[PDB]
Amino acid sequence: DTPSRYLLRKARRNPNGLQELRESMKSSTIYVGNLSFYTSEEQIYELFSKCGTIKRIIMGLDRFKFTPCGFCFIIYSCPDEALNALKYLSDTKLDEKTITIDLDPGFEDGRQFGRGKSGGQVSDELRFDFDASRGGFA
Amino acid sequence: CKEMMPDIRTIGESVKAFEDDIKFLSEAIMNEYGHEDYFNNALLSTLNAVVVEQPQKQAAIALLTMVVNSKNNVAGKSIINYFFEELQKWCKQTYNDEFKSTSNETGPWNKIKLILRFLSILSPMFLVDELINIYKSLFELSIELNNLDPGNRVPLSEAIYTNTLLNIPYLFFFNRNNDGLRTKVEELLAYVEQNYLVKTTDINLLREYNGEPPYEMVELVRVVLPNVKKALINNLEQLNELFPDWNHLLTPQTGDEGFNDALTLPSVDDLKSFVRLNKNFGSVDSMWKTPRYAFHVYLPNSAGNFETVVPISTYAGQLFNDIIIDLVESLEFNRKEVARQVITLDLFFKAGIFTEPGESIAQLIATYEENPLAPTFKIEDLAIETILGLIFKLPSVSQPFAYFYTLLVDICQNSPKAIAPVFGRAFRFFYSHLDSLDFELKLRYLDWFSIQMSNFNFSWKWNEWEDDSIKFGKYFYNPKVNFAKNLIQKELRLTSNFSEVEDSLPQEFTKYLDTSYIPRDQLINYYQSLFTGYTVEEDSVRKNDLYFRQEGVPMENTVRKILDYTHKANNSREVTELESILGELKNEYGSIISDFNRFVIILLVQAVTDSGSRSLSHANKYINDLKEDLKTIFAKIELDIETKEYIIIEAVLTFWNANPQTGFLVADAFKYAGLLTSRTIFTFIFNETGLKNNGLIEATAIEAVFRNLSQQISEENESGNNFEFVFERLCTIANSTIDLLDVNADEDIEIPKVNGEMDIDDIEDDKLDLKWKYFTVIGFIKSILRRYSHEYRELADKFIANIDNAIPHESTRRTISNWIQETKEV
């Protein structure tokens, strides 16, 4: 019930809100968020492989400078390995950071880019708090 | 319907008296027991459901059944009748192919063991004389192998013996048929000493640590029997273990029951002359769940400031361990709720160790905290003991590997005053006993300790490992320094930097670090790179393998041509033009195209991986954009296909020998894209070039082998499931599409079709056993025995005759043949 429709995510959702609820519960994809700005795909490959063989990964990038901006999209083969990654590869450390892993409804081009008006995440445009591996005072 | 069921699944966790909660619930249910037409039929099934899937509260559910039996003897007859049939359900349909023949989770006999434990617990509700009668018929299954069923399996006789012997901790102390119980004990003791001497081959495969000191990994049949003899020597009065609800304080004052006044009043029903359904041939029934070892590393004086210990040879040890393991099995998928019933066990475990998240919302890992086990029992050791014995459980864990890490990471977000020190003490003890631990459990402890360090900030007491890292003469192949090397390598790929792991270890421990994953190019600027890192008689830390020297290596002039045509965005047709000049670089040297072109294959793979060596994504994109060349330079129809696919993997290994993380994903990518075969990766992980990484015993190489075999099993499973789903679709495309899937299922099964590899290390007089080719290769035969029990079983015609008993009859060495026999005796 915690892994659910992560509401106010999927902004500019191409389908309807029911189709946003549809296929998310059978998705094999989990949008990892809040990760460090120096975290790499190889570190993400390490952690996510504890709950099955990954089939693709997509780092979240700044829409104007293309550097990593604190998010990721992991793509599992089977949704049963993804649901294990929900319960057993959230709530832990990835380069000593929060690694929140909402199973968003599938990959699409453009979603890998941050939707912030400054280029980063929309979460990052409003967090003035000093987090060094997230740019600092953002 | 959905109101009485929540009531029957809340009782035991409240703030009032459990005596008052059980008495009130009995009257409400009896009010709902407006005889069977209204709601008894719903109440019977819900009570039986609670006594199959909630074994940790067996005493709770038995008192309410006794309370219901006191109010209605007809309901006490009906509940015991349905429970015996559900036992007859769960024993005959113990086969998980009755989740196919009935599509219901009716299945494995451990549920029936909790079913028969409940009826044994319900000895005051149902006649004791009938209990010993069914106990005889269970024991007679051991004597079935004498005359009644003279070829039955040892696991079938064990699990009927063990269901009786595990029921002993609740109401073996019923002296009516004392003469009968001695005869039952004499039959079982003879059967335990006959079978498990003759079938001791199973125990050497499943031993977590093959060392008598400090604790012995006793077989489950030979551990519960000493626990039963210790209980019998204590006048059957098991004490400080059961939180029973059924002989006290309405007759007594003591503490068990608020109900023994009423309990003695009601009639006790018979048990309908139970006979265990005879085992058919082992293909459509008789799943026969395997024997087990008993993990034990905790004892008295492992803590000497808590209320002492349940002994290893004690019923209080077995009861607390079974209650913890069955509780984690009940809420495993929810680590904040898995915490909330794994240690506080309750009856009623009052908040010593408050619990995790440190929110104390789940304040229900709280143990010692005084006694569900009726005195004082220090479960805080035992909770860490029970979770270690599941993650190290041969042949495979009861749950996902990482879920133990997240639960234990919760169980340190738990009371740090006590639970973090005990987890550190257990980590030190397992490290000290590394010299005889299984390689399966050694890799399990390597992954667990690295990931646990990766949730902290690598804050370890490294200099306490000075046994193998200050006495460095204890040569690296030994398990202690080898584990710390593999842990630091696993912690390197989790800290995400080499230099972060290098700073965290001491200067002495820097020798056993993880070294420099940077690429090794054989077509790099190796005259200047002769100066930068060709120390060659030094720099042997395996940082690189740049075996060029200058222009003059074969096809060097085409490598630089292929290098300029890997920047600037060349194309697949253009790459074939550059391939023709390396084909021309084999005509000269004397083969006009050479038709598999291993030299051309060496030149392309070296340049492309170098030009992609900036991320795993860049190699993945490069292997996708040039896949058509890589398919044609692997090769086409048979093993000229394999000869350069191996040489593609050989060149990729030479480039990425310092980078175990990159090569593993590269071997995964070639298999999924069909640029190599699982058969080719199997022979590559037995090649001479790969023998000297660290061994065949290298942890990433075993990871590469196992993930390759699991994808083949996943491709077989996905094909067979599409076959049945098209069989479900009224057989339209299932003449065609199942046949192509069964060919795809016979492609990842008849090229799971292994050949002989362990046929010459026994032909010299070297130690084949216990070298780095039995530390790996017999522990990997064990790792081919474990987790692929199914796959061995389905090939058993080819496995016995064609794959074992050509060499591994008495013709092969008895060392190799023992591990084959040990997988058969499971």
Next chain:
Amino acid sequence: KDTDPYRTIFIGRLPYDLDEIELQKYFVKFGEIEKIRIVKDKITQKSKGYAFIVFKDPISSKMAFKEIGVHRGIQIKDRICIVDIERG
């Protein structure tokens, strides 16, 4: 641009004629201070009424916010200066 930001507390609406020494005496009661910096208008050095106070530890900084901020404003000179975190 002093040390780590969770140790730096923000106090604002401070008195216009105040002193950095008596601001230091007020803030030190809840822990050792590492640095102070009263802010003045860069166009002309009118005291802006806000200041930056660096404590040695962030647990010591959050006690000064709790104590002297939630009590209606820290009674300095003849003004009530409310206190919070650095917010930058």
